[PDB]
Symmetry: D2
Subunit: 293 residues, 4 copies
């Protein structure tokens, strides 16, 4: 019931040595809130969860929860391709005060639909707070079928929605039909988020909103009230950025953008690396198009 | 330019021997028009252009044009993976009274962007009427890049638009930005048509509108009037059908649906073949969901 | 049985106007034979089948059959995505003296396995001479399943083999196993042909043999005699040329290579177009590495 | 240079609670060796590395090293999508007595060629023993370009080769040309290993060799001395099992197969799950076909 509109997949700012910059993080979360973001999602993919330790993951969530002071929902990443690790991560996120967890389909080991059911069901039984399934075939190769999604949301009261990063907007409809109008569908793809909403989504767990939280929340508020005229005008401001920040592997591009706005430094953890100067120029053009410079 | 809304990718009704059912076709087009369709597209892929002869292609266009009598636009298929054949087909479509031609990206031979430019430019130079580019990677493999699209509609006044069947809604945005708001965007994919419109589309060259031309015409009008609450309600009625007519190779599904409504028979030309019983049942239930069967 | 070794996917030389150059075609076919090619395949993809008329298709086959004078097998292309058109193309090939036909999986309309069965069975019932199945998902999208091949070669004594252009060498094993050791398997991919013979192939319907008929004949002979040390070394000479003539859409590349050896001019039919200079330099280096100029 | 022939990507036996079954593991390694395997690779993908803890990872390598007693090379898995993690895994592997490490292209985060260079270089600098590159786009999505392979083997003496799981045999030829004939090339795809050796491979880091270590070793020795008649004959015995052990997600298939030979139990850790009966039947059939059951 809480999750709709623009929800930022928070970057995790690092210092010159690659250590977490806590102050930059907290100042970034405050800004996101005062700019009008409708929710935040710490320690996901965009937050460099693959290269964070368990201790860092906990700490970032703790800081994020404390800085937010309940003003907006906190949907923390708790993803792994190991079910027992995902269980431990979701439990930590709950202890650290998260309002829900975002849990990706296991990547690399390519489980089947029964494997997906065992994975998400084990997590669901281990915690009390709600779970958003993060379906992303472009990264995990496998894909959670709608029927599996239905089974999980029907069998567990705390499995309540999806971050649909398929960018295949027809899925929004099938999911609405088979999981219900009550199934909370958030886009996981800025590039198709507008169309996603038209098909039944109610917002986006966003990358671009790291640097444009106001415009993103405006676009999604426009969608929530059925003002698609305004939504299409805003989309047009954002699309070039939406694309540009995925030219090179994320979050190199969204971090450079934040950095251009003075929000953090550009440092990322290997195998994520610095942008080439061509990509930098293209992000600059896109930021200018959006009115952010 | 005035080309907007629901435009049916018309099926070609066959009789029991696989010959053109010319009566059923003319009656179907009339029904299409009285049901409120905003345009029709004869002899495209859904019309089994792969298995039609040159003489059939010509004839069906003629009958479509005579029946339609300029009440709505007729956008005839003139696709081939041979530039010189595509040119000849387009010329035939124009001579037969077509208002525009629908031209697929060459398939099988996998040309590059240069090849695509040469293909479409040779066609545009050969006729006066408008051309809509039919980008469909899922069938042609290759994909006309947005920069090729923009270049073609810059260099030729009569290349005006796209039937975008990529089903990747972000392309509507990039096309709008780089080809202009003038550039006519129509979805070629009923399953993502709603969202396509949200990103900038002005309608859809539809398969499902063969059997639901009123609902589809209404869905797109809803989008055209920017009433997206109504559009979504109508989308929910149509979506199961939209999917179900693509479980097996098209247009077996759509023709079966048309059959159940008495619009035509179910015969298709090989390698298109009859549905399995399981697909018939899914299409039946989808048609009840849409309220097309009562 | 005589379908083994190197079989050239013949180019169709055109004059400056794009008309068939009959005299260049006949001379090229003679040269192919004298250079030791084990067979020829007119009017397929490499011969620009998509952009030839029915009359041109018949004529090229006619000239090829006449020139070859039974010295090697002629496997004529008779492909289409219309069954009725493929049937007529096969009947013309047979009437023109072809020893077999090469029939591709329908492209563009994406038939299912039942449609594929209907399509090939129709052709098999219309002609007496053998049919080789041309499986090439990279151009047709659909793939003929091994079960379907197996079914077709059980039910029709004149469906005898495959031009396997999948580039997935494991398929040669499954095909060998389920269609039989008697099923004639030939590679449709020069780049993987050596390996495909290892798994059970007995040759290749080749693009590279257009310009390297002797070396390709030598390599597949090595394979046929089970001399793989020699085959690997001949491959080392051919691989750059094998890759290079696919950098741009074929047959622009193979035609340019033939032009460089004085065998024909470079004209192709739209939408196939002239090569860029980068590509022509790369082909030149490949031809030089092979010892062909 | 001693890295040739059939090298088993070792499964990791678990007891009924999913804990490491250590006696099963040690007995299995012993069996692999006496059956004539040419090397072992513990705590890789087939050994369920994604679901092992660092402490388990360390223990399985220690056991494997002690059990092998230098009779054959031990190529320990040290894969991660985090560079700092892979670095630490590679160090424990070395400190545990591995002769080499097997390091997969980072998965999920989809790095570019420069990120791959940074990832692999950092590992090379942190250890002394050799590194084999595990290229597997079917799981990591990204591919390590051949130029990138070349750059790493040029700049680092201890990066010496590839476990090539692309299944695209032309890569063997390209890698042979550009990285050197000294570059060590092992197939990571039992289904294409035969042809991979023909194009220049010198072995295979194998899943099927878990249950057929002798037959697999025989096939690769046949290739190593260029007896491809024999190679093919042994390939025809194994191919059905090579496919079958991947119908469902690995190592569910190969462990069932191993349980059918009394080598371990069928327990795997989620999200890996037990086989359905349809796959079990197919695996039985292919075991009978290879002569491993009568």
């Amino acid at each position: 019931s809480m999750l709709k509109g623009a929800v930022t997949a928070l970057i995790t700012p690092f210092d010159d040595n690659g250590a977490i910059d806590e102050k930059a993080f907290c100042n970034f979360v405050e800004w996101q809130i005062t700019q009008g973001i409708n929710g935040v999602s710490p320690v996901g993919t965009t937050g460099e969860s693959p290269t964070l330790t368990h201790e860092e993951h906990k700490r970032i969530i703790e800081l994020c929860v404390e800085q937010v002071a309940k003003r907006v929902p906190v949907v923390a990443g708790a993803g792994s391709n190991s079910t027992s690790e995902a269980v431990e991560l979701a439990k930590h996120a709950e202890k650290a005060g998260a309002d829900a967890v975002l849990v990706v389909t296991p990547y690399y080991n390519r489980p089947n639909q029964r494997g997906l059911y065992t994975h998400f069901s084990s997590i669901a039984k281990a915690i009390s707070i709600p779970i958003i399934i993060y379906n992303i075939p472009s990264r995990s190769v496998i894909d959670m079928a709608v029927e599996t999604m239905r089974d999980l949301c029907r069998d567990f009261k705390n499995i309540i929605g999806v971050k649909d990063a398929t960018g295949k907007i027809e899925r929004a409809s099938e999911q609405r039909e088979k999981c219900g109008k009550d199934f909370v569908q958030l886009s996981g793809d800025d590039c198709t988020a507008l169309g996603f909403n038209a098909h039944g989504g109610v917002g986006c767990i966003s990358v671009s909103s790291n640097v444009a939280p106001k415009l993103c929340a405006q676009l999604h508020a426009a969608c929530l009230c059925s003002d698609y005229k305004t939504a299409l005008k805003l989309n047009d401001l954002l699309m070039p950025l939406n694309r540009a920040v995925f030219i090179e592997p994320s979050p190199a591009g969204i971090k450079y953008a934040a950095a251009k706005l003075g929000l953090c430094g550009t440092i990322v953890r290997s195998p994520i690396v610095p942008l080439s100067d061509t990509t930098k120029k293209i992000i600059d053009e896109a930021l200018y198009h959006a009115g952010l410079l």
